[PDB]
Amino acid sequence: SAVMATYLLHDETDIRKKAEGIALGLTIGTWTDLPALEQEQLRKHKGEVVAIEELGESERVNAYFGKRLKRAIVKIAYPTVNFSADLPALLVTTFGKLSLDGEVRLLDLEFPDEWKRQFPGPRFGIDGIRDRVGVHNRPLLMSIFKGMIGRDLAYLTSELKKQALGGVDLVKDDEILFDSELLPFEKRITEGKAALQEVYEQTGKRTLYAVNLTGKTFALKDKAKRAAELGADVLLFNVFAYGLDVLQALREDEEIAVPIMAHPAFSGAVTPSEFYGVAPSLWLGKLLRLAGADFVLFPSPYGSVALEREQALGIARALTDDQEPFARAFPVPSAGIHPGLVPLIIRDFGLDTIVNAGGGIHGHPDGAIGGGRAFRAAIDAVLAGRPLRAAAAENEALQKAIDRWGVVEVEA
Amino acid sequence: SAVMATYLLHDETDIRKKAEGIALGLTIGTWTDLPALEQEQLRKHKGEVVAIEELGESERVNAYFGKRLKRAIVKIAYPTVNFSADLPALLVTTFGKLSLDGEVRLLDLEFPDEWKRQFPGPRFGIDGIRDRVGVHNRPLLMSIFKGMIGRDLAYLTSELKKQALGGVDLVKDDEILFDSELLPFEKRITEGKAALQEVYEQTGKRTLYAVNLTGKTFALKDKAKRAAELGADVLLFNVFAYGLDVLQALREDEEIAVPIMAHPAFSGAVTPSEFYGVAPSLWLGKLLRLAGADFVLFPSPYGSVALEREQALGIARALTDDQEPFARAFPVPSAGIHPGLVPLIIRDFGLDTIVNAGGGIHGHPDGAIGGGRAFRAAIDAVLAGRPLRAAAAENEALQKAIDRWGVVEVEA
Numbered sequence: 095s096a097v098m099a100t101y102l103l104h105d106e107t108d109i110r111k112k113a114e115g116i117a118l119g120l121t122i123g124t125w126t127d128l129p130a131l132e133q134e135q136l137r138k139h140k141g142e143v144v145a146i147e148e149l150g151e152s153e154r155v156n157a158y159f160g161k162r163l164k165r166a167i168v169k170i171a172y173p174t175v176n177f178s179a180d181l182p183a184l185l186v187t188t189f190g191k192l193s194l195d196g197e198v199r200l201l202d203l204e205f206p207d208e209w210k211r212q213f214p215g216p217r218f219g220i221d222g223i224r225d226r227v228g229v230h231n232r233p234l235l236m237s238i239f240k241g242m243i244g245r246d247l248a249y250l251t252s253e254l255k256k257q258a259l260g261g262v263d264l265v266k267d268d269e270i271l272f273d274s275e276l277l278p279f280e281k282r283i284t285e286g287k288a289a290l291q292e293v294y295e296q297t298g299k300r301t302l303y304a305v306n307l308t309g310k311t312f313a314l315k316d317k318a319k320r321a322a323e324l325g326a327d328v329l330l331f332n333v334f335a336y337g338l339d340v341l342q343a344l345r346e347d348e349e350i351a352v353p354i355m356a357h358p359a360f361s362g363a364v365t366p367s368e369f370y371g372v373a374p375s376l377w378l379g380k381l382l383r384l385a386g387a388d389f390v391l392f393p394s395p396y397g398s399v400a401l402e403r404e405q406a407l408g409i410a411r412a413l414t415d416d417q418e419p420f421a422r423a424f425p426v427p428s429a430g431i432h433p434g435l436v437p438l439i440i441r442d443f444g445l446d447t448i449v450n451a452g453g454g455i456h457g458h459p460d461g462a463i464g465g466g467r468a469f470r471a472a473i474d475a476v477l478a479g480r481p482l483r484a485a486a487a488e489n490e491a492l493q494k495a496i497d498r499w500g501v502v503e504v505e506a
Numbered sequence: 507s508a509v510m511a512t513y514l515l516h517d518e519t520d521i522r523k524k525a526e527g528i529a530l531g532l533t534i535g536t537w538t539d540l541p542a543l544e545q546e547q548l549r550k551h552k553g554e555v556v557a558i559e560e561l562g563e564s565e566r567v568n569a570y571f572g573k574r575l576k577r578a579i580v581k582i583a584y585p586t587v588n589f590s591a592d593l594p595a596l597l598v599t600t601f602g603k604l605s606l607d608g609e610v611r612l613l614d615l616e617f618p619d620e621w622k623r624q625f626p627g628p629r630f631g632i633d634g635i636r637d638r639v640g641v642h643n644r645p646l647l648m649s650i651f652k653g654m655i656g657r658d659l660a661y662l663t664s665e666l667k668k669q670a671l672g673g674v675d676l677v678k679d680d681e682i683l684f685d686s687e688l689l690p691f692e693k694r695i696t697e698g699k700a701a702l703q704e705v706y707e708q709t710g711k712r713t714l715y716a717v718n719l720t721g722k723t724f725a726l727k728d729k730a731k732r733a734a735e736l737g738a739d740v741l742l743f744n745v746f747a748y749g750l751d752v753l754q755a756l757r758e759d760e761e762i763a764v765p766i767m768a769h770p771a772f773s774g775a776v777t778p779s780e781f782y783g784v785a786p787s788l789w790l791g792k793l794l795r796l797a798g799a800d801f802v803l804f805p806s807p808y809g810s811v812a813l814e815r816e817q818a819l820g821i822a823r824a825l826t827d828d829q830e831p832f833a834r835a836f837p838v839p840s841a842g843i844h845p846g847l848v849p850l851i852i853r854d855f856g857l858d859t860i861v862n863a864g865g866g867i868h869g870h871p872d873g874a875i876g877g878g879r880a881f882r883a884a885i886d887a888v889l890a891g892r893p894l895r896a897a898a899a900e901n902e903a904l905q906k907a908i909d910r911w912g913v914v915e916v917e918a
């Protein structure tokens with residue numbers, strides 16, 4: 095039983111020598127000088143280099159570093175008997191001191207099925223969330239509150255209604271919305287709930303509210319329990335600012351048992367480099383799903399700061415792969431989203447995804463209501479097998495969106 | 507009252523425009539579309555671009571990216587009334603969504619003194635640690651166990667005594683040493699304490715043991731409290747695998763009140779990039795000191811993976827700057843350390859530093875005892891104003907070390 099870590103290395107010196115050094119150094123430390131009796135005893139703890147895929151030197155990279163760097167993908171097996179069954183131990187064992195060793199980037203971690211079972215996975219996942227909001231088949235639609243910092247509850251309820259009236263399935267707090275006297279955590283939940291039921295009463299639409307769960311680590315479980323008692327729909331959580339283990343703890347607490355939406359804030363401090371850090375498929379995908387996230391918002395492959403398409407798809411695949419002993423986490427491509435992008439979003443990510451209108455929904459000529467109507471009309475068009483403009487001809491909200499932001503061509 | 511964040515940005519588009527968009531987008535969202543009542547209401551919550559230092563383009567960077575990237579150091583002010591007084595809120599506000607915005611690297615954070623006072627700083631600091639170990643004036647000396655994974659308590663105590671007999675002031679667990687049936691957390695502490703007291707009786711030397719505090723986040727306080735009851739000397743903590751807030755929580759718990767040694771494990775996933783992440787002076791220095799670390803181990807500016815010298819000095823300055831309302835934290839340059847570097851270490855970092863012999867102390871011809879004597883003799887030589895070779899001619903342990911690793915020139 096061993097966790098196999100896959101790394102990308104750049105180095106002036108022999109890669110194989112470095113790999114062997116890591117396998118031994120990060121496990122038992124010494125081997126050759128140990129008596130036969132000890133070797134047999136410590137055999138089970140010995141790390142091993144599983145594979146080394148030599149890559150071609152990159153002129154671009156060599157020019158950047160001003161030296162000749164050999165490149166290779168290295169796989170190392172770490173016996174699970176070497177560390178405790180928790181994410182902090184996993185990270186320190188596979189990328190602790192090693193993260194300081196020059197150019198090394200963690201690309202993936204493969205866990206033996208038995209080890210994975212010691213972790214929760216999402217409590218609800220895609221299936222559970224779809225039931226909770228009552229929406230099947232079509233992708234979901236969500237938006238974000240705009241300009242709430244410094245505002246009061248009346249403003250919150252008013253803004254929440256507009257978004258719900260626009261037909262969005264879920265509305266979340268801005269990740270930078272923290273608790274205050276004006277907007278207490280518990281009040282956002284209860285006031286928001288009342289407002290959303292009123293909307294159901296009038297339009298027949300069911301909308302959930304993902305409230306930001308913030309503050310100090312050791313106060314999270316108590317407030318989350320309170321949120322659960324108050325009937326909070328979803329808990330938005332800036333996991334990367336707290337640690338993966340905290341997400342897991344929230345997921346495993348039976349007194350909480352509320353869906354958890356993981357926000358990507360701060361993940362960018364770790365994922366972008368070509369030579370260092372941790373790949374997004376692992377940091378935002380595999381690990382967040384295993385830790386308990388029901389929703390995972392990540393950089394979309396569209397817009398001004400689009401994530402490389404294959405990287406974005408890789409995240410979605412890790413979140414939904416049915417080979418994992420966990421429920422699927424909802425992939426939520428975020429940033430650079432507008433109605434004209436719906437056909438591409440569905441083509442790239444499928445129907446089990448969430449169209450995140452973000453705060454941009456408010457930028458529609460007719461406010462959030464018009465913005466939500468445009469998105470819902472666009473989603474229906476794709477499911478009805480029609481081009482957006484065909485639906486736009488019958489839906490003013492959508493036509494206004496198209497004239498404002500256009501339609502992204504999907505024809506290959 | 508605002509936290510001023512300093513960033514390094516690379517972008518092919520106008521930097522000031524992007525900076526203004528960040529200051530506004532990450533605070534109140536919109537301004538020019540607000541009525542008078544709302545503007546005066548949200549004025550105090552409005553972020554502002556404090557300054558922009560244009561750096562000019564780099565051909566090396568341009569070649570790497572394959573395009574022209576403008577470069578500038580940007581300072582933005584975020585009103586403290588915008589977020590709760592906790593580190594997770596601080597990180598999310600200043601580098602949450604922003605960490606995903608292309609090429610942005612967080613270099614520093616400056617806070618009003620009143621805001622700083624809401625945080626603990628080290629409980630003991632340099633002065634406190636020197637008292638607890640009983641060593642003043644001279645820099646301290648510490649080492650690490652070698653290959654303890656899979657070993658038993660008989661081996662632990664044996665190796666611990668050898669290091670203490672070498673004259674080291676502190677011995678720490680390997681950061682990858684996790685609790686097991688062979689080496690339970692509480693037993694390492696109690697047996698280690700007994701073994702160390704035997705050494706004092708023999709050589710009159712006092713040696714502390716920094717035990718690894720691991721496991722799940724919500725079990726940390728309980729075991730740390732047990733460690734205190736059992737008389738643990740120092741708690742080694744892989745803070746980056748958890749979160750800054752957890753370190754702060756451990757520091758503020760009056761039922762623990764045991765020195766905390768922060769390990770750099772995983773910090774490398776965040777600090778090395780030229781275009782992304784967080785600068786080490788802030789990530790390993792300023793924030794760890796503010797959060798509560800009494801000792802901070804960080805990449806030394808020596809050896810195969812040496813951290814650029816000014817960066818390393820920057821970390822040490824953040825840890826010891828007397829201008830901060832916190833006790834000074836012990837700077838511990840780590841990696842690439844050998845007796846021949848002692849003169850340079852003292853010249854670079856001063857007397858209030860710790861010479862981290864690491865696991866290399868065991869590589870001395872005469873084991874840890876000889877390795878420790880070599881280091882102690884090296885430190886004494888520098889304080890006595892003598893060349894290492896002069897002292898080596900009178901100290902075998904040191905002579906052996908010098909012949910093996912040599913002496914690094916300290917003359918400017």
Ligand SMILES: [Mg+2]
Nearest residue numbers: 268269270603
């Ligand atoms: Mg946001």
Ligand SMILES: [Mg+2]
Nearest residue numbers: 191680681682
């Ligand atoms: Mg170590």
